[PDB]
């Protein structure tokens, strides 16, 4: 149950890229099957995405470097 996201607007430049990176994170988490890093409350993926965006441990650049390193390590394991 998320009621206020004003601090998220304070964190990211605007709401467009905010909801874009939130959608990418939710796609990589829910239909991606990966693991989160924030304690949940038996909820959906949207509100935990908003929570981990509000904290600051996940953003555009962090998602970019994470997916890049994942692709690199997958290519390395592929040999």
């Amino acid at each position: 149950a998320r009621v206020t996201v004003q601090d998220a607007v304070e964190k990211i430049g605007n709401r467009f890229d905010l909801v874009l990176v939130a959608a990418r994170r939710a796609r990589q988490m829910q239909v991606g099957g990966k693991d989160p890093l924030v304690p949940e409350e038996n909820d959906k993926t949207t509100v935990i995405a908003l929570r981990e965006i509000e904290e600051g441990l996940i953003n555009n650049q962090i998602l970019d470097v994470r997916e890049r390193q994942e692709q690199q390590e997958q290519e390395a394991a592929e040999l």
Partner: protein, 1343 residues
């Protein structure tokens, strides 16, 4: 995945090779058989197999024979979807060009090959076909002939003279036409010709042909060398008839038929292709059955039946519920209620997925059975699936952004949708039976978006104004007003407490009353300079209700905000301060708790109005008797023969108005008083405790006029003519209204009801227009990086302060750095965002005007930058890039149109219009500034004004102007320049009945260049006696006096020509036609006094400013009836030949000849004389103006300033607050097109209305060079025309005039970047405005 679309002619060979397979067989379908018709209309090699991975014959269905066709079928085993996407060709018999290229206004075939429309038609149609390959003949290579001349020339030229007809004729003509030579010839002819009509025709022709020869087009490419066939899923029988005619030709042409037979055959095939192109534009009206024609690629693509307009923009959507609303007061603000059945039905696949994810239901059938059975176990699944899945509430009429909002649903009973009370005011949805809809995002991205942007908590500031749209409604504010309204004597009078919890205990225990002044202890938190809150304890002396309310407000706000009566304005400003100081996060919960406490205490209050709750004034009957006695005395005076009907009518009207005002004031005074209570004394009269006063004064639901009509007399009612009847309603609602009283009441009320209905039915059209005119822009660039702007000042025109500075500038970035009155002070530097503290600094610095940014000053092409737009108006920060500010602007403009009365009585000159009362009066004291200073001390020591554009402003005790007043044309002012005169008195005067000719210097005057009986007559005055000479006009004069223009030569005391100080030219006062001369020649004319009262009309009034059609015309920029004409060129004005139907006039400046000619109707007078060398752009005829001349003669900032001022005047007359950014961007979109006035070294000429940003980016390349770029001139036009003149054809095609605009678009041949919004809705692509915009940029980084 698409870039800007474009539409033109290109590569018919690739158009051919794009599809495969022939359909020459004229037979429709071999329905009797079931083998693949290799050439039939419903073939396979053109489209595909009948079904997916199945042959057409039905003899093979597996995936083993796939790879080779059958023995005699030819079906390649594949998917059937390609049938909906693959095409072929109808085998042709004669290459046709077009028929739809003829009625395009003008034709698109003749106007490209120097041939008239009728000639091209009679070539393609059997009237007179063209001769080609003449031979030794003396005919031109591209000259058309007729049948008779082709026959008589066939004798002198037997076989060398030939001719073709229709399709192949036009094919050979366009093939043998080398347009580049024709284009060069046309350009040379244009450079040689000198005319107007031929010039315009030839420049349109040369532009239309240059745009074709520059693009990848060709003349022969216009010929439909190959005609593709339409798949069966989508005209079918039409091209069946076409191929039937083709087969008839091939069976009647391959036999070497005579030329006439093959001519008829190819012309019939041409007519068939013309049928294919259009059914009605060719000249034939086919029918399908019982006089029912069929279509040709379209019938009417407009309205609610077309494709590109209706079904690709508006249609039905599934997963949408619709129900009624009801007040849910217990639910939180962010959430809303939802019925059990609605949530169960609108989420059946969500329930299916949640059940299949677990072991409750594996297969889909069992899951559906369990869901439809509605077991008690599935309820937890439905509860979990809606725990964090918000939905969208939608009101049926959506005018602004908040028409659709996001809410977290909670499951409840009843088929009604519970709604939060604090949001219905934003929805404009009362609970009288309003039905609303609910939608589901259905997508993870869509769910995240709805939770992020359209969330209820994320939308509290109105998109129009920064004020909170979540303002409390009547119930909560009434409860709070009752709670904080302190009395004089109650339980616990003057006791002492130590905490608000003690007050709550005392109240809920029944020991002390609710409202009673007591000493309590409050621990408040003052906001530190940083993000901290310093705590301080203080013993306040306030009522118990305020201490109760203190438990709800957060620690940030001080105690002084709650120490009031808490009216509607008070609680709204309290919420505003809470949002401004504490941000957005705690404001939501604060408002929720405020509503909770308001409801609770309004319930515990017991507010109710009864019969004895509206006291009737005792002196009301006395006042009414005195008023009726006075009007009876006035009527007897009129009947005695002392006054006329008009003045006695006005007297009765004002007497009744004064009596109504007095009785209403008496009632209002009697309401508050008489509530005397004993608080340890005898008499302690205070604010009344009456219920109706608590409901009215609190501003909750009742207003002053309503309670006035309820308690006191109703007032004055009028007929639809607006004339107030002489019989006022002398009763009130508490008493019984007489029959005639209620009759007049409903007579006046039905008009208002019908006006409201018609206006709420009409506002949708204007809203749609305002949406479509300014929807093609999005905020793309961050900062355009410019220096231009507009000068903003507090609106002081007329009254003291109509609109202050702060509210007009807060919300943007100053274009130029604001300079404090102290020199070299940059406390507000360039490119700075504004805040409440910032505007506070601007006000304390006594800043008069500020150069603020604007959307027009943003030089970014195809879009506006966020840095020069302003704030968000919904989030308290700088606006970002991407959002469609144009759409929100159109919404915020068209939303409050529901408060615009069309025309009830507002005409502008309702009370009176006279220029005798033009004496200027003022209130404040300070400096006096004068613009257009022409003030001369006359021989009588007074000060006379010798100008019209002179305006008198009052600079205050700090430096700012507060009052502005216009002086009439040649007025008299007792004051002067810089005279520190007090306020409260009139110091001017003027004559409305005429226009004096007051002088500036002394001396004599004589009838120089005058004569009686030729241009002047002999008339005497019937009031004084002296003869009043009448200078004739162009109407009542003969031929011998047409060449004479009399005047008055001002001379000195001796009688010689005056020597004007400053110049060397004498100044005589010219007397135009129809003039009155009273002070005749040879008299001592005192300086600064009326001499010749030239007549002029002073009773014209047609103002409709207080009406919606006024705003409609302002947005359309339509020409008014009598436009206020302006002077095109400066200098002197010379009158020449007249009576050419009307009067004519010439103007010539000092730095040029007189190429400007104008005409003036004889019923419109002039403003200035001939001897006045006036400046261009000055007023000539008083009245309504036209924005075209304003823009083209005063600049860009002046016209938009006038437009914004007028629309703000209208909206403040209707009591509507609207920020100026929306009207700014609208007026900016209005003049998106401009015209060239000097070709220069560019590639275009002055006869081409080129878009402003396009001609600007054309200058971007010439900026590096020394060649002059262009000479643009902005010319605003109708928003309907500006929308039709859109660079994008996709947005234009679906717009109105679908037939015209579709023709003009699909025959243009141009490129459109679809850098807008409507095209994306057409194709269905993601709009480049919201979350997709950056996404688009996300796919624009690499490529």
């Amino acid at each position: 995945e698409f870039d800007a679309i474009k539409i033109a002619l290109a590569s018919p060979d690739m158009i051919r090779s794009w599809s495969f397979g022939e359909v020459k067989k004229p037979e429709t379908i071999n329905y009797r058989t079931f083998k693949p018709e290799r050439d039939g209309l419903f073939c396979a090699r053109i489209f595909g197999p009948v079904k997916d991975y199945e042959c057409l014959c039905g003899k093979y269905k597996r995936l083993k024979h796939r790879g080779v066709i059958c023995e005699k079928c030819g079906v390649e085993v594949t998917q059937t979807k390609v049938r909906r996407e693959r095409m072929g060709h109808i085998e042709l018999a004669s290459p046709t060009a077009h028929i739809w290229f003829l009625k395009s206004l003008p034709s698109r075939i003749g106007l490209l090959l120097d041939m008239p429309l009728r000639d091209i038609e009679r070539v393609l149609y059997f009237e007179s076909y063209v001769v080609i390959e003449g031979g030794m003949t003396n005919l031109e290579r591209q000259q058309i002939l007729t049948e008779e001349q082709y026959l008589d020339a066939l004798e002198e030229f037997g076989d060398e003279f030939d001719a073709k007809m229709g399709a192949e004729a036009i094919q050979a003509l366009l093939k043998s036409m080398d347009l580049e030579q024709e284009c060069e010839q046309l350009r040379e002819e244009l450079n040689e010709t000198n005319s107007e009509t031929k010039r315009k025709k030839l420049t349109k022709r040369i532009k239309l042909l240059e745009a074709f020869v520059q693009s990848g087009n060709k003349p022969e490419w216009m010929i439909l060398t190959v005609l593709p066939v339409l798949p069966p899923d989508l005209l079918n029988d039409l091209y069946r008839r076409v191929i039937n005619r083709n087969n008839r030709l091939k069976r009647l042409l391959d036999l070497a038929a005579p030329d006439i037979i093959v001519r008829n055959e190819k012309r019939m095939l041409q007519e068939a292709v013309d049928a294919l192109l259009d059914n009605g534009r060719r000249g034939r009206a086919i029918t399908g059955s019982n006089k029912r024609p069929l279509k040709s690629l379209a019938d009417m693509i407009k309205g609610k039946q077309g494709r590109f307009r209706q079904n690709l923009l508006g249609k039905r959507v599934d997963y949408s519920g619709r129900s009624v609303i009801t007040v849910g007061p217990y639910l939180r603000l962010h959430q809303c209620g939802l019925p059990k059945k609605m949530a169960l039905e609108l989420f059946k696949p969500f329930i299916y997925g949640k059940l299949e994810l677990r072991g409750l239901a594996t297969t889909i059938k069992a899951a559906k059975k369990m869901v439809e059975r509605e077991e008690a176990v599935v309820w937890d699944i439905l509860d979990e699936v809606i725990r964090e899945h918000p939905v969208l509430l939608n009101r049926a009429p959506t005018l602004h952004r908040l028409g659709i909002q996001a809410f977290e649903p909670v499951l409840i009973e009843g088929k009604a949708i519970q709604l939060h009370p604090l949001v219905c005011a934003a929805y404009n949805a009362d609970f009288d039976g309003d039905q609303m809809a609910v939608h589901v995002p259905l997508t993870l991205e869509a769910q995240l978006e709805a939770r992020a942007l359209m969330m209820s908590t994320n939308n509290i500031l109105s998109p129009a104004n920064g004020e909170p749209i979540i303002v409390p409604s009547q119930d909560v504010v009434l409860g709070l007003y009752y709670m904080t309204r302190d009395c004089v004597n109650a339980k616990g009078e003057g006791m002492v407490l130590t905490g608000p919890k003690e007050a709550e205990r005392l109240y809920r225990s029944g020991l002390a009353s609710l409202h009673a002044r007591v000493k309590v202890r409050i621990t408040e938190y003052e906001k530190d300079a940083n993000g901290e809150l310093v705590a301080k304890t203080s013993l306040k002396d306030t009522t118990v209700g305020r201490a109760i309310l203190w438990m709800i407000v957060p620690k940030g706000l001080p105690y002084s905000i709650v120490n009031q009566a808490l009216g509607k304005k008070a609680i709204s400003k309290m919420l505003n301060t809470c949002y401004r100081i504490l941000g957005l996060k705690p404001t939501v919960i604060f408002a929720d708790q405020i509503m909770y406490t308001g409801f609770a205490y309004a319930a515990r209050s017991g507010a109710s109005v009864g019969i004895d709750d509206m006291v009737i004034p005792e002196k009301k009957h006395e006042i009414i008797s005195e008023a009726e006695a006075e009007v009876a005395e006035i009527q007897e005076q009129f009947q005695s023969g002392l006054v006329t009907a008009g003045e006695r009518y006005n007297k009765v009207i004002d007497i009744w108005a004064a009596a109504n005002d007095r009785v209403s004031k008496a009632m209002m005074d009697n309401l508050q008083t008489e509530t005397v209570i004993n608080r340890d004394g005898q008499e302690e009269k205070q604010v009344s405790f009456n219920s109706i006063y608590m409901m009215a004064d609190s501003g909750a639901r009742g207003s002053a006029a309503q309670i006035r009509q309820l308690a006191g007399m109703r007032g004055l009612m009028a007929k639809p003519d607006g004339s107030i009847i002489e019989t006022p309603i002398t009763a009130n609602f508490r008493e019984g209204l007489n029959v005639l009283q209620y009759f007049i009441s409903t007579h006046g009320a039905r008009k208002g009801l019908a006006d409201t209905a018609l206006k709420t039915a009409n506002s949708g059209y204007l809203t749609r227009r305002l949406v479509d005119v300014a929807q093609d822009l999005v905020v793309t660039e961050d900062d355009c990086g410019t220096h231009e702007g507009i000068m903003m000042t507090p609106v002081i025109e007329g009254g003291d302060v109509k609109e202050p500075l702060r509210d007009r500038v807060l919300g943007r970035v100053t274009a130029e750095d604001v300079l404090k009155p102290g020199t070299a002070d940059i406390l507000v530097p360039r490119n700075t965002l504004l805040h409440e503290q910032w505007c506070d600094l601007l006000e304390e610095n006594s800043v008069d005007a500020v150069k603020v940014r604007s959307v027009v000053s943003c030089d970014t092409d195809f879009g506006v930058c966020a840095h020069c737009y302003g704030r968000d108006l919904a989030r308290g920060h700088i606006i970002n890039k991407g959002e469609a500010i144009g759409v929100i602007a159109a919404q915020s403009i068209g939303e409050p149109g529901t408060q615009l009365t069309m025309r009830t009585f507002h005409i502008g000159g309702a009370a009176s219009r006279a220029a005798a009362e033009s004496s200027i009066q003022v209130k404040n004291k300070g400096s006096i500034k004068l613009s257009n200073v022409k003030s001369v001390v006359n021989s009588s020591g007074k000060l006379v004004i010798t100008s019209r554009n002179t305006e008198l402003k009052l600079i205050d005790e700090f430096g700012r102007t507060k009052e502005s007043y216009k002086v009439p044309y040649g007025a008299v002012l007792a004051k002067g320049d810089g005279e520190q005169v007090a306020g409260g008195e009139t110091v001017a005067n003027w004559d409305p009945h005429t226009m004096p000719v007051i002088t500036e210097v002394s001396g004599f005057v004589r009838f120089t260049d005058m004569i009686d009986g030729q241009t002047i007559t002999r008339q005497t005055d019937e009031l004084t006696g002296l003869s009043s000479l009448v200078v004739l006009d162009s109407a009542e004069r003969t031929a011998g006096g047409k060449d004479l223009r009399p005047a008055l030569k001002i001379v000195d005391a001796q009688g010689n020509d005056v020597l004007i100080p400053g110049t060397d030219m004498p100044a005589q006062y010219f007397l135009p036609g129809k003039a009155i001369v009273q002070l005749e020649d040879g008299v001592q004319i005192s300086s600064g006094d009326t001499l010749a009262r030239i007549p002029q009309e002073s009773g014209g009034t047609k103002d409709i400013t207080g009406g919606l059609p006024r705003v409609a015309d302002l947005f359309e920029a339509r020409r008014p009836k009598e436009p206020a004409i302006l002077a095109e060129i400066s200098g002197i004005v010379s009158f020449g030949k007249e009576t050419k139907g009307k009067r004519r006039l010439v103007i010539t400046p000092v730095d040029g000849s007189d190429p400007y000619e104008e005409m003036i109707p004889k019923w419109r007078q002039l403003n200035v004389f001939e001897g006045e060398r006036v400046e261009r752009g000055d007023v000539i005829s008083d009245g309504p103006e036209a924005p075209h001349d304003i823009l083209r003669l005063r600049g860009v900032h002046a016209v938009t300033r006038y437009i914004v001022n007028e629309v703000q005047d209208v909206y403040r007359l209707q009591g509507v607050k609207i920020n100026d950014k929306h009207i700014e961007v609208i007026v900016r979109q209005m003049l998106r097109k401009a015209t060239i006035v000097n070709a220069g070294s560019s590639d275009f000429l002055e006869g081409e209305q080129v878009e402003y940003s396009r001609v600007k980016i054309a200058n971007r390349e010439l900026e590096a060079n020394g060649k002059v770029g262009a000479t643009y001139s902005r010319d605003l036009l109708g928003i309907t025309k500006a929308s039709l003149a859109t660079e994008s054809f996709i947005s234009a095609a679906s717009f109105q005039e679908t037939t015209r605009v579709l023709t003009e678009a699909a025959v243009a041949g141009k490129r459109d970047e679809l850098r807008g919004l409507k095209e994306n809705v057409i194709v269905g692509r993601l709009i480049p405005a919201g979350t997709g915009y950056a996404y688009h940029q996300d796919r624009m980084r690499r490529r």
